[PDB]
Design an enzyme around this catalytic site. Structure first.
Site, PDB file in Angstrom:
ATOM      1  N   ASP A  95      -4.358   4.773   8.325  1.00 51.88           N
ATOM      2  CA  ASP A  95      -4.016   4.954   6.928  1.00 51.88           C
ATOM      3  C   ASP A  95      -5.233   5.633   6.268  1.00 51.88           C
ATOM      4  O   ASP A  95      -6.256   4.978   6.043  1.00 51.88           O
ATOM      5  CB  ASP A  95      -3.725   3.617   6.263  1.00 51.88           C
ATOM      6  CG  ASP A  95      -2.520   2.816   6.774  1.00 51.88           C
ATOM      7  OD1 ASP A  95      -1.959   3.194   7.821  1.00 51.88           O
ATOM      8  OD2 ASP A  95      -2.159   1.831   6.080  1.00 51.88           O
ATOM      9  N   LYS A 160       1.820   6.230   1.270  1.00 49.19           N
ATOM     10  CA  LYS A 160       1.491   4.858   0.938  1.00 49.19           C
ATOM     11  C   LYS A 160       0.988   4.829  -0.494  1.00 49.19           C
ATOM     12  O   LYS A 160       0.182   5.676  -0.869  1.00 49.19           O
ATOM     13  CB  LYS A 160       0.443   4.456   1.987  1.00 49.19           C
ATOM     14  CG  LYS A 160      -0.246   3.141   1.765  1.00 49.19           C
ATOM     15  CD  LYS A 160      -1.019   2.587   2.953  1.00 49.19           C
ATOM     16  CE  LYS A 160      -1.826   1.449   2.521  1.00 49.19           C
ATOM     17  NZ  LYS A 160      -2.655   0.762   3.513  1.00 49.19           N
ATOM     18  N   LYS A 194       5.122   3.230   2.390  1.00 48.83           N
ATOM     19  CA  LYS A 194       4.483   1.924   2.425  1.00 48.83           C
ATOM     20  C   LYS A 194       4.028   1.496   1.030  1.00 48.83           C
ATOM     21  O   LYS A 194       3.287   2.215   0.335  1.00 48.83           O
ATOM     22  CB  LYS A 194       3.320   1.891   3.428  1.00 48.83           C
ATOM     23  CG  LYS A 194       2.473   0.645   3.395  1.00 48.83           C
ATOM     24  CD  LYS A 194       1.509   0.649   4.574  1.00 48.83           C
ATOM     25  CE  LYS A 194       0.503  -0.461   4.477  1.00 48.83           C
ATOM     26  NZ  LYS A 194      -0.519  -0.422   5.527  1.00 48.83           N
TER      27      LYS A 194
HETATM   28  C1  LIG Z   1      -3.604   0.126   2.972  1.00 54.78           C
HETATM   29  C2  LIG Z   1      -4.548  -0.610   3.738  1.00 54.78           C
HETATM   30  C3  LIG Z   1      -5.453  -1.309   3.145  1.00 54.78           C
HETATM   31  C4  LIG Z   1      -6.399  -2.182   3.832  1.00 54.78           C
HETATM   32  C5  LIG Z   1      -7.368  -2.952   3.183  1.00 54.78           C
HETATM   33  C6  LIG Z   1      -8.224  -3.767   3.896  1.00 54.78           C
HETATM   34  C7  LIG Z   1      -8.117  -3.767   5.288  1.00 54.78           C
HETATM   35  N1  LIG Z   1      -8.981  -4.592   6.071  1.00 54.78           N
HETATM   36  O1  LIG Z   1      -9.410  -5.628   5.586  1.00 54.78           O
HETATM   37  O2  LIG Z   1      -9.160  -4.266   7.218  1.00 54.78           O
HETATM   38  C8  LIG Z   1      -7.163  -3.020   5.968  1.00 54.78           C
HETATM   39  C9  LIG Z   1      -6.318  -2.233   5.223  1.00 54.78           C
END
Ligand SMILES: *C/C=C/c1ccc([N+](=O)[O-])cc1
EC number: 4.1.2.4
Length: 243
Positions: A95, A160, A194
C-alpha cells in the site's frame, strides 16, 4: 442482515495493530468465524509475520505493508526503493502513499510516475499495489477523483482512502466518490477499493459494503476488490457475530 454483512466484512479486513505485537496480530487474524483477508505490518515485520502465519496453519492470509508512508512525499526513488524492499521482504501487497501534496500543488505527473514505478516493481513479483490517496487531506471531490484517476491510469490494483495517520480518514462520501471513479473509468474488474478508518462498527461496515453493492452488484466486493482497516472494527464485527 448485520450478521451476514459482519462476516463478509471480517473476511475483507486488512488487520493492523515488536515481534510480540506482530505475532499477536497474526493470531488475531485467525478468528473463530474465519480469517481476515490480510494483515498489515511494516516491511521489516514481514518475515516474522510469514513464519507466524505458516506456523498457525493460515498461510493464505495475505501480508500487506506500506511504503512512502505515511507522508506521501514526491521522491519517486525513495518510494520505489521502499517498495522493492517490501517486495524483497516477502510482501503479498504494498500500500503506497500517493504524492497528494504534489497533486494539490498542481503536479499530476509525479503521482502518475510514482505509482507507475511502484506498480512495475510489484507486478514483476506478482504483488498487488494499493494506492493511498489520503482523501482526508485532498478534501475536495475533484481532487479525490483526480488522484483516483491518476492512480488507476498508472496501474493501481486498489485505490485506498487513507493512511489512518491524519485527522480525517474514510467517510461514506469519499468511499462513494472513489468507487464512482472505478465505475466511470470502467475498471471494476481490475481495480479494488479499500476503506481505512471511518469504520468503527459493524453497522458502519455494512453501509460501506452497501455502496459497493449498489454500484457494482453484490458479488463484486470479494477480497480482490474490497478491503477494510480500522482500529476497533474487528472487535465490533466479532461482537455482532456473538464472540
Ligand atoms: C493503510 C495501511 C495503513 C497501515 C498503518 C499502520 C500499519 N502498521 O502498523 O504496520 C500498517 C498499515
Amino acid at each position: 442482515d448485520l450478521k451476514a454483512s459482519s462476516l463478509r466484512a471480517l473476511k475483507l479486513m486488512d488487520l493492523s495493530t515488536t515481534d510480540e505485537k506482530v505475532i499477536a496480530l497474526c493470531h488475531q487474524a485467525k478468528t473463530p468465524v474465519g480469517n481476515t483477508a490480510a494483515i498489515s505490518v511494516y516491511p521489516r515485520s514481514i518475515p516474522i509475520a510469514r513464519k507466524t502465519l505458516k506456523e498457525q496453519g493460515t498461510p493464505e492470509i495475505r501480508i500487506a505493508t506500506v511504503t512512502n508512508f505515511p507522508h506521501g512525499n514526491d521522491d519517486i526513488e525513495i518510494a520505489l526503493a521502499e517498495t522493492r524492499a517490501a517486495i524483497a521482504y516477502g510482501a503479498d501487497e504494498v500500500d503506497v502513499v500517493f504524492p497528494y501534496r504534489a497533486l494539490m500543488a498542481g503536479n499530476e505527473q509525479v503521482g502518475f510516475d510514482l505509482v507507475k514505478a511502484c506498480k512495475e516493481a510489484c507486478a514483476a513479483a506478482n504483488v498487488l499495489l494499493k494506492v493511498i490517496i489520503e482523501t482526508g487531506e485532498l478534501k475536495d471531490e475533484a481532487l479525490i477523483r483526480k488522484a483516483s484517476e491518476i492512480s488507476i491510469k498508472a496501474g493501481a490494483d486498489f485505490i485506498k482512502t487513507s493512511t489512518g495517520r491524519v485527522a480525517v480518514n474514510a467517510t461514506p462520501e469519499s468511499a462513494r466518490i472513489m468507487m464512482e471513479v472505478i465505475r466511470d473509468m470502467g475498471v471494476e474488474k481490475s481495480v479494488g477499493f479499500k476503506v481505512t478508518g471511518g469504520v468503527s462498527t459493524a453497522e458502519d461496515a455494512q453501509k460501506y459494503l452497501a455502496i459497493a453493492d449498489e454500484l457494482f452488484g453484490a458479488d463484486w466486493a470479494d477480497a480482490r476488490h474490497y478491503r477494510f482497516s480500522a482500529s476497533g472494527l474487528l472487535a465490533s464485527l466479532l461482537k455482532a457475530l456473538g464472540h
